[PDB]
Amino acid sequence: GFFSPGIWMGLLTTLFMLFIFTYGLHMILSLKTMDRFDD
Amino acid sequence: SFFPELYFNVDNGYLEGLVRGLKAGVLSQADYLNLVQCETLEDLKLHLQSTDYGNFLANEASPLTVSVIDDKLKEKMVVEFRHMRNHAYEPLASFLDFITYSYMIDNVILLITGTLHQRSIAELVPKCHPLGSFEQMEAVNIAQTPAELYNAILVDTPLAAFFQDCISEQDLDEMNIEIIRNTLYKAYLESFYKFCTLLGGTTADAMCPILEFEADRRAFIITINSFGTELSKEDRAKLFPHCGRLYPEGLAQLARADDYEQVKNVADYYPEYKLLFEGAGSNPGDKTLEDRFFEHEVKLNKLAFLNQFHFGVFYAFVKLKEQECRNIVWIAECIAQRHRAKIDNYIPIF
Amino acid sequence: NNPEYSSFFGVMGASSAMVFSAMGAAYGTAKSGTGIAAMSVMRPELIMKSIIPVVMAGIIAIYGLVVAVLIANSLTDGITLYRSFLQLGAGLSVGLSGLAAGFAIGIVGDAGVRGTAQQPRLFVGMILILIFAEVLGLYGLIVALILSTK
Amino acid sequence: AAGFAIGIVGDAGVRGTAQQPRLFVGMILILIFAEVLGLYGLIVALILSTK
Amino acid sequence: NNPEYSSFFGVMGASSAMVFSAMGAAYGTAKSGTGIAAMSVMRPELIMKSIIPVVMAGIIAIYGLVVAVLIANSLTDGITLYRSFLQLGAGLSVGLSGLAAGFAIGIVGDAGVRGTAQQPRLFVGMILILIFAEVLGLYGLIVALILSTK
Amino acid sequence: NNPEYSSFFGVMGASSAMVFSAMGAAYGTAKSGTGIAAMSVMRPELIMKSIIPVVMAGIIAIYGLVVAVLIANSLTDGITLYRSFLQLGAGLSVGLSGLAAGFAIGIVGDAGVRGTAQQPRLFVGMILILIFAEVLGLYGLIVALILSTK
Amino acid sequence: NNPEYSSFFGVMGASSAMVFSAMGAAYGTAKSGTGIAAMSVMRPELIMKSIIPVVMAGIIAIYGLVVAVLIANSLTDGITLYRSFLQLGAGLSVGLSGLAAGFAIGIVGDAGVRGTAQQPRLFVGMILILIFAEVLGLYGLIVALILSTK
Amino acid sequence: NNPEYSSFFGVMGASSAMVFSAMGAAYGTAKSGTGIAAMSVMRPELIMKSIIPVVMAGIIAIYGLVVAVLIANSLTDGITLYRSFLQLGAGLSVGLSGLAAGFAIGIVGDAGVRGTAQQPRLFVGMILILIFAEVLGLYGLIVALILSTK
Amino acid sequence: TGLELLYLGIFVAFWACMIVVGICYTIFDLGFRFDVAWFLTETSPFMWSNLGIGLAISLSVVGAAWGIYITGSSIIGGGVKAPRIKTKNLVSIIFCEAVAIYGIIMAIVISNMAEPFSATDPKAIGHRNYHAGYSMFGAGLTVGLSNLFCGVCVGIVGSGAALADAQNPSLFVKILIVEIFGSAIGLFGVIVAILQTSRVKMG
């Protein structure tokens, strides 16, 4: 077959962890640094 | 909806709270009455010390003058806005920069006016509005060359985008400074409206009405003031911003307008402007059209605070504090000139 | 007896516990850091006082590390699917909890460092919030300790 | 993640230190707190790889 | 005998003929109504004449309805898989052609009603464009019938 | 002699009929809602008159409900795959037709209530346009019934 | 006997009923609350009245809960695939209808609360619109019940 | 002999030939309509003369219709998988070539009608460019017909 | 919107692939290969149960952190000019944190229902074990997502109440009611989760 029970379990685990990693990386990439400093 | 609730406070929540706290310090009606009851500018400072202003004027010389009070108010507003800007991130930073473009447009007009009349550019900086300071050195030591000044604006000033409405530096010596200023302001207002619309969400909702009213009042007052001048209708219509609620057939009718009666007829189609025109008796002793537009602008800025997760709060606060500074200066003028009768002409806020 | 892939999930749990927590901590250590850099120009004396957010972000990472180690030391060759997925659940719990807690700590610290620069009285207030955010990550760790030792 | 943290913190700190030199030490501390994150990963990696 | 999943494609043809045509008509009606509301502020007398876009948008929906009903009448327990494919193709053709026609009618009608507030002579031109933006749906209908009645 | 999973599709008909329609109705009741508020500040006397859009949006929801209930009463344990596909098609048709009609009603109602504050004569025009949008949903219902009562 | 996996769809039905209804209620409460808080500074005496939309949003959650409870009480490990699909459909219907109703209630409540801050006469109007949105959630509940009891 | 699923690709070919061509023509018509609405305000007497781009988009739609009807008349129950693929390829070729030609026609017509409001001499140029876009769709038709008659 | 573009592209590609794959399976008479039963059955119940517990805790913590920072930014921004806020508005934060607490509790209430099988054949694993896994996963989803939404909602309402408090002290006491309503949703989720795992028994 295209998939097997071990492959299916691994793919679902990796999919959940890829969702979590994408959330974390999206929030990290949104980090911005100030372009000015107080006089 | 854009769901600004979920992510707005990530970068701008602290500044949202801070600007709302600053807005909480704008003089209320009771404070305005207290200041109205003063007898001398010293008493005005005394009654003003109990408000959020505090000791901003204690250092200055005892023989106070209206110019000193105005300068101190402008300095305080500039300091507060600069502090907010320095702590702002990319989107809100661009928004605050757009706010400052409004004063940069007047400052650049001052620079070109001085340069064409051959006065040192370095000697014009003191008269420029602080919020639109040209800290860039490319537009300094220009040697009184209009072409060099135009190149400096294009290279090292955010107004380069708005100066493409013109066609060349020769326009600086060709078009009247007022026409240049109004064309620059039209371009700036259109860019600001596009930016706010792109931001979308509560920002667009709470900011597009204010820019729309700005465009409409610009159109109305450019039509009304240009009736007796050489400004032709074809050239006049170029100064009408396209953001307003008059864009379809309204701005065209204003361009064809040839009298204040026709402007009133054009405004009649819009009840919100119909009321402003009706209340603007314009005869001595009652509110003029500009005062009615100021009241409506203050109302819109105040309503901008009923939304929460948006950048329009910063523009609203800046405009409200500008109006508050003008009100305080007006009260000081009425005190100094002993013209108590008109002391109520200030536009109250909150 | 047990499938030869049974050890995958648990391993990923361990790695997740280290990765996401670190990401959380990183975000905190970034955001607070930015805030400190913005504050310290006008109020240098508050740098040490205002370094608390970063420390808390670091604490989050430690939690993840703990769980990761706790899972990395319990991975046996014949690790059953039950234990493997228990460790995966513990890893997901601790990692995502640390990620969220690090985001909250970063944002709250970036706001509160500047606020304490403006109003000193806010310092304690900021702390009173940060700890809350921090324990969110802790809660995840707690569940991990419940799971990986079920 | 540690590289992201070091980038943000180090850039902000080197730009601020031009204004307030006293921030330098501050920056370093924060950088260390970012650096250890990577170290933590390394530790776990070893604990897994040398198992 | 025949596959049991053929009725799925038949009902998908019917529901597509209805849904996509309805989406196109809805977009056309929404855009035309926005244009009419914007126009009528200064030119009230054109509130009715400027409703032709909406009607021309509604027609698109009718096309879809026609095909949908046809399919919903041609469905039976033992439609050959080929017949189900014919019905699905007819439904997709009518629905998506009507969707494109509705987009075109909405845009053209909005622009035409806004312009006619300033230039009466545009009205006739607008009508022509709407017809050219409506026959598209008609074309789809034709094809659908050629597929549905085969 | 029928698959035990045959009812699935039929259920996804009922569900869909009540879900999508509701969503559509919601959008209507949302957009018109905002519009009324925006126009209620200056023209309070038109609040009750300008509630027609919401009512129309509400009717859209009812359409879905009807079909949903109908489907929910036509479901059986031994429902054939053919009848299940018919019910799924009817549910999708009514739900998405109501969704499109709700989008159109919301946009048209917002625009119309905002305009009528400025142009009273537009009211009737708005109603007409709204009716057209409503008709779209009605079409779906018709098809749904034809599919759901074969 | 029945399939081993039959209870999956019933479980997902309960989970959807609660999750999506909670999403809708949470959005409604958040939007209404952020409108109410911002209004209160201008019109402090209206808060209590303006709490009505929040209550309505809360009711949506209750609907979900109700249906969820049903699905969580009628769901055994050996339910037929038909009943499991019925419970999944009921859960999806109630959850997504409540989601749409919660979005509509949030939008309408925020807008109407601000308008009432600016125009007291709008209050009653707002209530009407809110009811029209609230009813949407009710509709879902009805269908859900019809599906879950069947 | 032939697989029962062969006609799927043929019906998809017909549906594509109609749908994508209609989408292209609709985009062309919409862009040209917006351009004419913008143009007609200042130069009304060019409206009739400026309707050409819409006509060219209609011709693209007619190409699509021709290929769709050809495929829908050569589609039989015992359609060889090879002939079904031929018809799918013809449909995709004509549909997407017409989509590209419609995009080009829309953009070119909008620009040309807007410019001709200011420069009469541009008119002829526009026509030329439009023809150079039109042939694109023609090319597609050519290929489609070949594949349809192969 | 580059990252948004990437997410939209992945979503569209995945679902277009799913549509075409379903069409191919249905039409080529290969539906028997699309055994959803085989997927739900061979997949170990332990995966479902442990994902359920992990989500129950992690999504609750995510909602708690979301609300905490949403309302803490506003609290610490408003308190620059009205520090009293920091004293009074911690209740908002408390509510957010309460969400997380429910999470762990439900995690426990779910983690107590786990037990190994010593079986691999689906007939051996049985309806009881499969339903236990599915119901633990569903309860985890319910509690986690309800807590996520409740925490975000309470955070938004708390930020609003903190901004309102900075300008008028006598408003928070009347705005907290909204938070209370926003909190109820959390409880509801927990209740439903408790009802989903009431009769769950692995072994």
Ligand SMILES: CCCCCCCCCCCCCCCCCC(=O)OC[C@H](COP(=O)([O-])OCC[N+](C)(C)C)OC(=O)CCCCCCCCCCCCCCCCC
């Ligand atoms: C902290 C988290 C960070 C983010 C998440 C990233 C995690 C990625 C982890 C690696 C991928 C794992 C995928 C699932 C498979 C898990 C293993 C498993 O259970 O398999 C046992 C199974 C057991 O098989 P079985 O016995 O069940 O199968 C039945 C029997 N046979 C095989 C005979 C039919 O065996 C395998 O190894 C299956 C093959 C799976 C391989 C999947 C491809 C992964 C591709 C890697 C990603 C792309 C890399 C390139 C990237 C380019 C640069 C950016």
Ligand SMILES: CCCCCCCCCCCCCCCCCC(=O)OC[C@H](COP(=O)([O-])OCC[N+](C)(C)C)OC(=O)CCCCCCCCCCCCCCCCC
């Ligand atoms: C772009 C973003 C990054 C990607 C993110 C999204 C990833 C999506 C994941 C894809 C996995 C899909 C499952 C593959 C298995 C099912 C395949 C199938 O149905 O065919 C085999 C099924 C079953 O095959 P079978 O069972 O007869 O084969 C015997 C069994 N094996 C092969 C295992 C020994 O049907 C066929 O045989 C069809 C043959 C033709 C192949 C048709 C595939 C469908 C898709 C083709 C076009 C691509 C779609 C996307 C379009 C472009 C992008 C929008």
Ligand SMILES: CCCCCCCCCCCCCCCCCC(=O)OC[C@H](COP(=O)([O-])OCC[N+](C)(C)C)OC(=O)CCCCCCCCCCCCCCCCC
């Ligand atoms: C606009 C998009 C362009 C259209 C094409 C999109 C990409 C699709 C191509 C993906 C690659 C797969 C190529 C075939 C690989 C070999 C497969 C094989 O062995 O087949 C055995 C399969 C399955 O086995 P079988 O059915 O042959 O064996 C008999 C099986 N029993 C007894 C059960 C019936 O059948 C075939 O022979 C299929 C041959 C043609 C497959 C063509 C690809 C399918 C997808 C086409 C697109 C679907 C949408 C159409 C409409 C689009 C309009 C926008």
Ligand SMILES: CCCCCCCCCCCCCCCCCC(=O)OC[C@H](COP(=O)([O-])OCC[N+](C)(C)C)OC(=O)CCCCCCCCCCCCCCCCC
């Ligand atoms: C994008 C939002 C989601 C909606 C689109 C995607 C939905 C499906 C995505 C998941 C992957 C694919 C699932 C289907 C897998 C195939 C199952 C199978 O072979 O068994 C079928 C089953 C059983 O097949 P069977 O071969 O066992 O036949 C029954 C035979 N007896 C009774 C003897 C056992 O029957 C069906 O046909 C059920 C319908 C579902 C299958 C078709 C999926 C549709 C995909 C979307 C395209 C719809 C076409 C119309 C396009 C226009 C839409 C408005």
Ligand SMILES: CCCCCCCCCCCCCCCCCCCC(=O)O[C@H](COC(=O)CCCCCCCCCCCCCC)COP(=O)(O)OCCN
């Ligand atoms: C590079 C990064 C690391 C690697 C990437 C990891 C992350 C991505 C992986 C996620 C999964 C994506 C692929 C999904 C495929 C869907 C089904 C394919 C259809 C198919 O042919 O499946 C058949 C079985 O499927 C079935 O039985 C149907 C089950 C479908 C369940 C799908 C649930 C998950 C995806 C969708 C929901 C997402 C939300 C989370 C739940 C196989 O047939 P065979 O011939 O092998 O059968 C042998 C015995 N019959």
Ligand SMILES: CCCCCCCCCCCCCCCCCCCC(=O)O[C@H](COC(=O)CCCCCCCCCCCCCC)COP(=O)(O)OCCN
């Ligand atoms: C649309 C046409 C059809 C497309 C079909 C193919 C599939 C989609 C592929 C993308 C196609 C569009 C091009 C997008 C390129 C990537 C996103 C923009 C660039 C980019 O990644 O850079 C920044 C992120 O940094 C990074 O480089 C980080 C990104 C890498 C993270 C990988 C982890 C995710 C793995 C996927 C699983 C998760 C699934 C979740 C649904 C974002 O730029 P900006 O927006 O800040 O600046 C504005 C301009 N860039």
Ligand SMILES: CCCCCCCCCCCCCCCCCCCC(=O)O[C@H](COC(=O)CCCCCCCCCCCCCC)COP(=O)(O)OCCN
């Ligand atoms: C217009 C858009 C499209 C709408 C149409 C619906 C699309 C839904 C997508 C799912 C796939 C379509 C559903 C029908 C196909 C099901 C698979 C049938 C294949 C088959 O024969 O498998 C049986 C087991 O599957 C079964 O009996 C499985 C029953 C359950 C099927 C439905 C589950 C789908 C997933 C729902 C998730 C919902 C999540 C909600 C949050 C055999 O089994 P056997 O007993 O003969 O074994 C004998 C072993 N020796």
Ligand SMILES: CC(C)CCC[C@@H](C)[C@H]1CC[C@H]2[C@@H]3CC=C4C[C@@H](O)CC[C@]4(C)[C@H]3CC[C@]12C
């Ligand atoms: C809004 C109205 C006026 C526009 C036209 C819609 C009506 C009249 C259309 C839509 C669906 C159509 C039906 C579609 C299919 C069939 C079955 C066919 O074998 C004979 C005619 C019959 C029964 C049609 C009669 C006319 C019909 C009912």
Ligand SMILES: CC(C)CCC[C@@H](C)[C@H]1CC[C@H]2[C@@H]3CC=C4C[C@@H](O)CC[C@]4(C)[C@H]3CC[C@]12C
């Ligand atoms: C004449 C123009 C305006 C088209 C309007 C009518 C169109 C939509 C309809 C009405 C009746 C239809 C015809 C009715 C019956 C048949 C016979 C069938 O075996 C193939 C299609 C064909 C030949 C249809 C083609 C499309 C058709 C002509």
Ligand SMILES: CC(C)CCC[C@@H](C)[C@H]1CC[C@H]2[C@@H]3CC=C4C[C@@H](O)CC[C@]4(C)[C@H]3CC[C@]12C
């Ligand atoms: C006012 C209350 C009842 C709700 C508003 C919607 C009402 C009018 C709708 C909802 C569901 C509908 C029912 C759905 C299904 C059927 C079965 C059909 O064979 C006869 C009509 C009947 C019995 C419908 C009558 C109208 C109905 C009761």
Ligand SMILES: CC(C)CCC[C@@H](C)[C@H]1CC[C@H]2[C@@H]3CC=C4C[C@@H](O)CC[C@]4(C)[C@H]3CC[C@]12C
């Ligand atoms: C303008 C009016 C008539 C339309 C509004 C009510 C609609 C929903 C009703 C009125 C009469 C209804 C039709 C009456 C009888 C049947 C026969 C049945 O086997 C299939 C549905 C069908 C064909 C109905 C479709 C829906 C229908 C058209």
Ligand SMILES: CC(C)CCC[C@@H](C)[C@H]1CC[C@H]2[C@@H]3CC=C4C[C@@H](O)CC[C@]4(C)[C@H]3CC[C@]12C
């Ligand atoms: C309306 C919501 C908030 C619930 C409040 C009222 C409760 C007590 C009512 C409303 C609808 C009712 C359900 C309606 C339908 C059925 C099937 C019926 O044959 C017997 C009981 C049962 C299962 C009812 C149980 C009690 C119920 C849930």
Ligand SMILES: CC(C)CCC[C@@H](C)[C@H]1CC[C@H]2[C@@H]3CC=C4C[C@@H](O)CC[C@]4(C)[C@H]3CC[C@]12C
């Ligand atoms: C209780 C208040 C909120 C009024 C709203 C009505 C809703 C919630 C309830 C009250 C009575 C209920 C009905 C009572 C009895 C049955 C019969 C059963 O076989 C299917 C469900 C059905 C048809 C119920 C549907 C939902 C229902 C109409």
Ligand SMILES: CC(C)CCC[C@@H](C)[C@H]1CC[C@H]2[C@@H]3CC=C4C[C@@H](O)CC[C@]4(C)[C@H]3CC[C@]12C
């Ligand atoms: C203005 C629009 C509608 C143009 C329509 C396109 C015309 C030219 C095309 C489309 C499909 C074509 C038909 C396709 C099939 C046949 C059957 C064949 O044995 C002889 C010619 C005939 C009858 C064709 C005549 C021309 C035709 C009707």
Ligand SMILES: CC(C)CCC[C@@H](C)[C@H]1CC[C@H]2[C@@H]3CC=C4C[C@@H](O)CC[C@]4(C)[C@H]3CC[C@]12C
């Ligand atoms: C409007 C026109 C220019 C577009 C179509 C181009 C014409 C010239 C082309 C396109 C497809 C071609 C046909 C494709 C295939 C065959 C089969 C062959 O055995 C005889 C020639 C014949 C019948 C071709 C005749 C010419 C043809 C009809």
Ligand SMILES: CC(C)CCC[C@@H](C)[C@H]1CC[C@H]2[C@@H]3CC=C4C[C@@H](O)CC[C@]4(C)[C@H]3CC[C@]12C
């Ligand atoms: C690019 C992203 C979107 C994913 C790629 C699309 C997927 C679904 C497509 C692309 C090519 C396809 C393969 C092409 C050919 C074959 C041979 C056939 O005998 C079995 C299926 C198989 C192996 C297909 C499976 C599905 C497949 C892998």
